[PDB]
Each structure stands twice: as C-alpha cells, then as structure tokens.
Design a protein around this ligand. Structure first.
Ligand code: E2W
Ligand code: E2W
Ligand code: NAG
Ligand code: NAG
Ligand code: NAG
Ligand code: NAG
Ligand code: CL
Lengths: 532, 532
C-alpha cells in the first residue's frame, strides 16, 4: 500500500492526515534507536533493533525527560513550547510527513527542535509539518534527541558518559534518514537539516563535525549557531557540573564509575529537579548540560575549525529575529514583567547587565554598560529596557551568528542571511518583547495558512514565501527561482555582506547586519577579557 | 597727568592710543620682575628692583625665547601666532590698558596667553587690549611668562631649577597687579584672570595653587583646563626630560648642579633647536616642558584637589570651541593638508589615533578606535577625518574641561559654561578645520569691531555681546545683567549641567556637553589603562 512502508528495520503503517482542503501521509513515532534506559542512560545511542510485523506509526511518540516551564500556567505563549505528550526516557523516535501521492526521490527537510539543550519536543503544534510538506512538495522529517543531563552530562574519558550523546542521537536519526527516506520517496541526496536556537547550534555542529558531514547536503540555521556562548562547555567545566550534579543528589564522587552508577539509579525527575543548581553563575541565557568540546565529535576548538575551514562546504541559509533577548529577560532579569511595559530603573539595568554577561570581569561590565546606554538620558526606563534586550540578543545570538556567517563564507559555496522582524498581529506576549525568539517558526511551518488560527492575509503570504524560500533553498541551494520576476534575495559575500528583511513589506537588501555592536562583541570585548 | 603714574617700583609714562574713533591710555612693556638671565635662568623670578626716573612705557616689550613656527612661511593664519617683536630672555613685562578718562576703582581683567607652554606673546595683534578695555570700561592687563625650557625645566630637589617657574612669573605679575593696579584706576579686589589653551590651563592652576588663590577674584577659562593631559607631568618625567635635554647638548649628567650649569651656558636658541627631541613618543598635542606636579605649587595631585574641594571657591566662566583638534592634526598627522579636504584613508586614520593617544596600550588603542568609527562606512574619508578631529578635540580639551567643570561645580559659587562654534567668515584656513582652536579670541578682544578687518555685521554683534558677557561676568560674577531683556545664560548646576552656544544665532541652552564621549574619556578609558 501507500501508507505501508517497509524500512530496513521493519514495516511501519502511517495514517492519512488532512491538511487544508486535502490530505497527505504521516508516519509518526518511528523508532530510530534502542530505548536508552537503565544501564544505557548517558551513553551513545544504539540503532533500533529490527522488529517483526507492522509498527503502528499513527500517533506522535513520547517527549523526552525535560524541565517543564510553569512560570505562566495556562498561558499559551509559554505552554506552546512545553511537552504535549507523556515524557519517557524511551523517547528517540522521529516523524515523517509525505506528500500524497508519494513522489519519487524528492527533497528532504529534517527539523531539529531547540530549547537550550535542556528542553524541546518533536511533537509540538508549531513543528506540525503537514503544511510545509504539502505546500512545497517536500518530505519533512522531525527528529528527537535527549536533552538536559540525559543528553549532555559529560565525564570525558569515561565511555559510560562521554557527552554529546544528544548530538549523537540526532546523528543516528540522520543516519536513519540516509537509509530509509528513499522508501518514503525521499531523495537521500537532497537532505536539508534545519533547526532553531539550540536546534540551530545543532545544525552548526553537524556542519563542523566530521562524523556528521556526509549525512546531509545543506543547512538552515535560525537564531542559533555552533559558536554561541551558551551552546558549549569545556570538558573541565562539563566535568565540574557533572560532579556537582552528583553532589546535589548526595552521590558517591570518587570515580566516574561510582558517580554514574549512582546517577543511573535516580528517577529522571530527581535529575531535572536539581539540573539548574550546577550552573557556575547567576545568569540569563545559560543552561546546565550542553555540548562538550571533547575532541572526538569536535576535532578541535570551534574557532580553529572555522579558521582553517575544517568544516562541511556547502550552502547555508540562516538568520535571526529582531528581539532575541526579550524572552530571557522576562524570566531571569529584574524589573521585567509580562503584564507591564517593563520600564527598567537604571539600578536594575546594572543588575540586568551583570546577569547577561556572567563571565565578564568588572572592566568588561563597564564596557558592556557604556556601550549600550544613551548618556544624555540614562534614567529613561525604556532606553534601558531596549538596552538590555539588545545586549542579550546581540551577545547570545546575533553577533555569534554573524561571526559564524563571516567565518563560514570564506570557505562555503553559498550564504543567504536574513533578519526576521515581523511583530505578528495575533501574538500573545506584550509589545515590549517585540519579535520574540522562536516566533519565526510559525511562518516556516506554515501556521498562518489555516484560517482558524486567525492570522492576517499578509502573514499568510509571508509564511508562504518563507516556506518557498526554505523549500526552494532545500531543492536548489538557492532560495530564488530562476524565472520568478521579483525579487532576488542576494548572496552574502565576504566584501559586500548583503542580507534581506523578512516581513510584510517588499523585500529590501541591507549590508553589515549589526556590524557596530558585533565588532564590540566579536572582537573588542573578547580582547578586553583575555587581557584583563 | 593721566599718562604718568607712580607705582611702588618707579614712575611709568604711558601713551595715548586711538581706538575706534576715540582714544585711551596704554602702558606697555612695564617690568614686573628682574630679568631671569645668566645665573637666573631656570630660577624663581625675583621682583623688579625699583628704578629711578621715568620708564618710557609706550612700546611693547620683547617676547620670550620660544620656538617659532615656519611650517607655512608668510601665511597670516600661522604667523598671527608667532612673536611680533624681538626675542630675549629679558621678556617679563606686563601691559595695561586704562580707559580715558581714568576710572576711580574699576574692574581688572588680566590676559594670560597660551601656546602650549612652549610659545606665546603678550604683544600679538590679536591680544590688542585697547578694544575691550575701551568698549566695556575695564582696566585690561596682559602679562608674560617664560615658556618651554626657560619656563619649565624641572629638576625636583634642585632649587636652582625647581620647575613651574613659568607659572611663578605669572603669579609675580599677579602680585604686581595687586600692589599697583590701583594707580591706574583698577580695583585689586575685582581682578579676573583669563587665558586660552595654555593660558586657560594656567588660570585653572592658580585656582588650585594656594600661593595664587588670593591674587584674583574670578576666572575665565577658554579651551584649557588644569587637568589637561598635555598640561602637566610628574617630577620623574619632568626630570628625565630635563636630563634628556642635557644629553642632546653633550652636558655633564652626573649631578644637577653641573647639568644646570652646562645648560645656562648654552645660547637660548641652542635650547630651542633641540626642545622637541625630548618627548617620549611620536605624538600630537604634547609639549616638552610643561608644569610639574611638584608638591609645592601643587600641594597634591590635581584629582585629589578636585575631589577634596582643595581649591578656590569662586565663579568661573569657561568653554570650548567646536573643533579644538583640527589645527593639531594639520601639523602632525598623516593625510591632513592645508590645501585639501584631508579625506583620511583608514590606514592613516589609525596612524592618527596612535599619534593621538600616545600613552595608550594597544587594548586602549582599539577602544579609542571603535568608539569613533562608523563601521558601516570605515573608508569614508570624511568621517575618518571628522572622526580623528573629535578624538584629539575630545581627548585634549573638551572632556578634560568638562571633568573640571563638574568637579569644580561641586564647590564653587557659580559656573557658566559655553560652546563657541562660530566659523569666522574671513577665516583664512580651509573649511575642514571648522571652529579652530584659538579663534574665539578675536571675538573676546573685539577685533570684529574694526571695519577694515572686514567682519560681517553679524560677527560684530557676537563680539560685542561676548565681551559684555566676559566683562559683565568680571565685575558682577555673572554673565548677565539681571532684570534686563536679553536672553539669559543659565548657571551650570550639578544636576542639570546646562550650557549655551556662542554664535550669531539667538541663544540656545543645551544639557550635558558631549557626555557620551566624555564618559569614555573620563571614566572608562582611564580604567582600561590601569588594568592588565
Ligand atoms: O532565574 N532564576 C531562577 C528561576 N526560577 C524559576 C522558578 C521555577 C523553576 C526553577 N528553575 C531554575 C533555576 C535557576 N535558573 C533557571 C533559569 C531558567 C529557568 Cl526556566 C529555570 C531556572 C537557577 C538555580 C535554581 C533554579 C523560573 C525561572 C527562573 O529564571
Ligand atoms: O607634529 N608637528 C610637527 C612636526 N614637525 C617636525 C619638524 C618641523 C619643526 C621641528 N619641531 C618638532 C619636532 C618634533 N615634534 C614636533 C611637534 C610639534 C612641533 Cl610644532 C614641532 C615639532 C619631533 C622631534 C623632531 C622635531 C617634525 C615632526 C613633527 O611632528
Ligand atoms: C494504531 O494505533 C491507534 C492509536 O490508538 C489505534 O487507534 C489504531 O486502531 C491502531 N491501528 C491498528 C491497525 O492497530
Ligand atoms: C560553488 O562551486 C562551484 C564549483 O566548485 C563554483 O563554480 C561556484 O562559483 C561556487 N559558488 C559559490 C557561491 O561559492
Ligand atoms: C618713548 O619711545 C617712543 C618710541 O620711539 C618715542 O616716540 C617717544 O618719544 C619716547 N619718549 C621718551 C620720553 O623718550
Ligand atoms: C554663593 O554663596 C552665597 C553665600 O556665600 C549663597 O547664598 C549663594 O546661593 C551661592 N551662589 C551660588 C551660585 O552657589
Ligand atoms: Cl567640520
């Protein structure tokens, strides 16, 4: 049949889901690794052993064990990113949408969720892939990987807890796509991985990792990049939090073997319930267990691999939102509220600044501070709040990404930069928060295109042509069509550094995104902190 | 007789000079100290021994031995600043302009010329006092003092050459006014010292120095401050420069007594011809022999005195011109030409900042560089040259002065702060230089009132109300005439820190003069340089 597909590990039976006026096929909850439980917690995935009979793949799988944001109970804006199914350690499954009728050898887009490496689900309504697969005639996969200590606890040296097993999870799913997408009419040669935030850092790290480079063709990165300050740790600091996690749970601490055996007997939510107590600073936009630079998944430092060009050469498409930081100030920084305008007394501004650059010394704090205040109007509660919003956005996403897009372009074969800044009309958060981190994703996944979600006609259009940009990029490596009258989105080149606005107005090209603050962030303050 | 006056040191006979279709009496080249010649070179002045007979005081006196600028031979724009009389170590003479008829007891303003403490004459055309004494009915005095090595060679411990003796020439002239001004109808209880650049710095340092506090009433400072980075040095630097001068002339360098011996046998121009070989770095806006923070004239460091309030509490009148640095880049930094727009390429721009901040470590260099660079336009010749202008303007005048005006206002009895930014219509220099360092002086001294000098009628008005500001402040301690119709120059207060624009247009009030750059130059960069 059409809804029956026979992979190299077993048969699976999908379901005919409707999407706008029509229907397509979906195969949800497909196993791709052996469940990682018991003795297998903190270890590299093992490929799912083959099954007999037909795997019922008609409902979403479980979500992985993860922290559950309860700051705003009932609030859709925060609830929409929480797990929506049961949470098991048995969670390494993927989902495929196939256009109906099944095409032969078509482009494949693998989605990779983010969530700071501490949270995120393959099964959220925002990652519902039926719209984009259908409208742009692509095969859409969305994978899953372990998060928090489950995915990234790291005792380098031990093979029982090496670290980066979450990235190894998503490489196994990619290797599953490589061997089975052809049985869904996916072309294993036209595979595009794409991810947001942690998921975008992840995309970046596969571009860098020699063990992952052959499992895909191209890459999209949204508001995330492999070199972000929150996105990695040294083995030493990785070890330290691993060890202190043992200390919170009154574990034996002499050797990794004893430590891990102690940590493997704890119920999963005992781990989640102390996961934040291992961070070295009072901070915003930092997460406890993240990828390690161990030397195996990452040959050397990310900077050196960028400099030597020791990475995958292909075309990348990538960009950032306008207000990356507003979400993280609302959760961790004083003076900000969901229900107020959040003007910020200057005293809170300093508290906010020291939170945003936890690692800086005093002199660097002053540099960050002088760099972002209007000294004709320092007690202006708005300019301070926008002040902080730009600090955490520029520090944690934008300037890290731009450093990556300049480094990569010296060696890549194509680069398209975007700047998404569309305040949705139906959005739930207050206006001060602007274009929220993560809220480009609705347009990528075509959610403006169903009329029951009450979007304006414009955001629909903008969603349809972002999907086309993404899809066309995934097919041809160029988001523009060759006929297509208007309006070509220019290559990003080392000398001219062009990019485009994603929003409801006619597209405009710009040069040097945030060059001024990014010189501060990528060259100067690094220099200040090294020498002081 | 009106032109014959009996002072405490002897009888003086003056001259009846015409002025603007009237006349007044001037007393020129009046001695106030013993000539500091032979064994008196480098030593503290001694009060002029009383003479017999009548001193023919109708001609200007000699100028001090000083460097002479030959960069543009014949060009009035620079020869305006060079000595216009013969030069001699016998140069310590003041000049008096008395209204006619003689006042009974009227205000006295004492001009203190600048010239980087290396140059300057009381007898320049632009310091002709007849116009302002005539127009605002004040007793105008114009003093002199040794400059460069003659005025500030500094070997602490040695009382044959202590340092600061150029400033002591000033104070001896100041006490001469104290004791004798009453005989010209001046009031020693209403004396206003005022000077420009090196002069303004000096005016500044008499309000610090205890031996000076009681020799005047008020203080006007123009484009100069005691705390200027070029305005002083330590004993250690002052001695090493004294010693390096001896090295440049084959002097005996074992003791000071032999050192100073050797130096007083050298002919004055032999000191001038090597003067500059002694600076520590290839720089701009720095000068060889300047005041020393010795512990006698200056009891402690300038900052401690500013913080502790250890200075004289009075009313000050001070301010700056719009483009203090343009003159100094024309003479010292690559790519500036007098006959060009001096569009600055970027490689010359950073030669510029290095020359501009000679004491900066490299980390300080990038700090300065990124704060004056439009990184969407780094090869914009204009903005680079405009940029470099601001750097040396802000670093050497603007921001030091604002530091002083805020430090002082915490303790004085009235601050009035100005921003001169009128480009004189008949200016000989090219327009890229703007409101050049030193060219408010023509308006202070009323030259636009001379018709043959071809100033615009609007320039005449600005000169007239500038001298009134100056003169009205010199008597009342306040620029304005109370309960009069003209718009009113507001006090500078610690909280609102207001100031006004001097120019042909109706008066504007502004707030915080160049705070953002000044926060950099006054709080952050100094902090950056302490650390390693
Ligand atoms: O901001 N400080 C705290 C803070 N408490 C809460 C309260 C609810 C769960 C607490 N869980 C967390 C803890 C800490 N940091 C966290 C950062 C982001 C997030 Cl979502 C949870 C964190 C550091 C160590 C203590 C726990 C919510 C947000 C929040 O930020
Ligand atoms: O920077 N302007 C002018 C400038 N002229 C020259 C030569 C022309 C006049 C000589 N006298 C000078 C010397 C030195 N530095 C000076 C700085 C400012 C002034 Cl006025 C005169 C200076 C450095 C050591 C050598 C002599 C050389 C370098 C230079 O920079
Ligand atoms: C597949 O699983 C769904 C989920 O409960 C169930 O409703 C459906 O009947 C199952 N189909 C078969 C053929 O087992
Ligand atoms: C990509 O590579 C091909 C062949 O290696 C080359 O001709 C083309 O110019 C490259 N394009 C870019 C944008 O790097
Ligand atoms: C003073 O000097 C001037 C300048 O030469 C001269 O004209 C005048 O007659 C002199 N007066 C006396 C009394 O010597
Ligand atoms: C100056 O001092 C007097 C008393 O000494 C005081 O009444 C007055 O307010 C002060 N003026 C200023 C401008 O500080
Ligand atoms: Cl200009």
């Amino acid at each position: 049949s059409e809804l029956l597909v026979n992979t190299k590990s077993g048969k699976v039976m999908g379901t005919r889901v409707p999407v706008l006026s029509s229907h397509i096929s979906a195969f949800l909850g497909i196993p791709f690794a052996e469940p990682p439980v018991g003795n297998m917690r903190f270890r590299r995935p093992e490929p799912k052993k083959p099954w007999s009979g037909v795997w019922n793949a008609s409902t979403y799988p479980n979500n992985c064990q993860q922290y559950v944001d309860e700051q705003f109970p009932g609030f859709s804006g925060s609830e929409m990113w929480n797990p929506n199914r049961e949470m098991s350690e048995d969670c390494l499954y993927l989902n495929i949408w196939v256009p109906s009728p099944r095409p032969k050898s078509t482009t494949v887009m693998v989605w990779i969720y983010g969530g700071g490496f501490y949270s995120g689900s393959s099964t959220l309504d925002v990652y519902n892939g039926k719209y984009l697969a259908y409208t742009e005639e692509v095969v859409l996969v969305s994978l899953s990987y372990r998060v928090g200590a489950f995915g990234f606890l790291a005792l380098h040296g031990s093979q029982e807890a090496p670290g980066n097993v979450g990235l190894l999870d998503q490489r196994m799913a990619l290797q599953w796509v490589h061997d089975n997408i052809q049985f869904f009419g996916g072309d294993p040669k036209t595979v595009t991985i794409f991810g947001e935030s942690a998921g975008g850092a992840s995309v970046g790290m596969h571009i860098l990792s020699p063990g992952s480079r052959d499992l895909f063709r191209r890459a999209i990165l949204q508001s995330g990049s492999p070199n972000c300050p929150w996105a990695s740790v040294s083995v030493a600091e990785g070890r330290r939090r691993a060890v202190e996690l043992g200390r919170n749970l009154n574990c034996n601490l002499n050797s990794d073997e004893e430590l891990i055996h102690c940590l493997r007997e704890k119920k999963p939510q005992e781990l989640i319930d102390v996961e934040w107590n291992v961070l070295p600073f009072d901070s915003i936009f930092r997460f406890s267990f993240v990828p390690v630079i161990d030397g195996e998944f990452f040959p050397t430092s990310l900077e050196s691999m960028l400099n030597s060009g020791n990475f995958k050469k292909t075309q990348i498409l990538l960009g950032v939102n306008k207000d990356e930081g507003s979400f993280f100030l609302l959760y961790g920084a004083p003076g900000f509220s969901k229900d107020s305008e959040s003007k910020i007394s200057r005293e809170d501004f300093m508290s906010g600044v020291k939170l945003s650059v936890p690692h800086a010394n005093d002199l660097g704090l002053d540099a960050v501070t002088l760099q972002y205040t209007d000294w004709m109007d320092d007690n202006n509660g708005i300019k301070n709040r926008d002040g902080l919003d730009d600090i955490v956005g520029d520090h944690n996403v934008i300037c890290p990404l731009m450093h990556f897009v300049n480094k990569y372009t010296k060696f890549g074969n194509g680069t398209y930069l975007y700047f998404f800044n569309h305040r949705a009309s139906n959005l739930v958060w207050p206006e001060w928060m602007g274009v929220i981190h993560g809220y480009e994703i609705e347009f990528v996944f075509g959610l403006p295109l169903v009329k029951e979600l009450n979007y304006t006609a414009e955001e629909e259009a903008l969603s349809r042509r972002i999907m086309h940009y993404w899809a066309t990029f995934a097919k041809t490596g160029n988001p523009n069509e060759p006929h297509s009258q208007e309006s070509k989105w220019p290559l990003f080149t080392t000398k001219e550094q062009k990019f485009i606005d994603l929003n409801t107005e006619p597209m405009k090209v710009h040069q040097r995104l945030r060059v001024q603050m990014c010189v501060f962030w990528n060259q100067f303050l690094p220099k200040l902190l090294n020498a002081t």
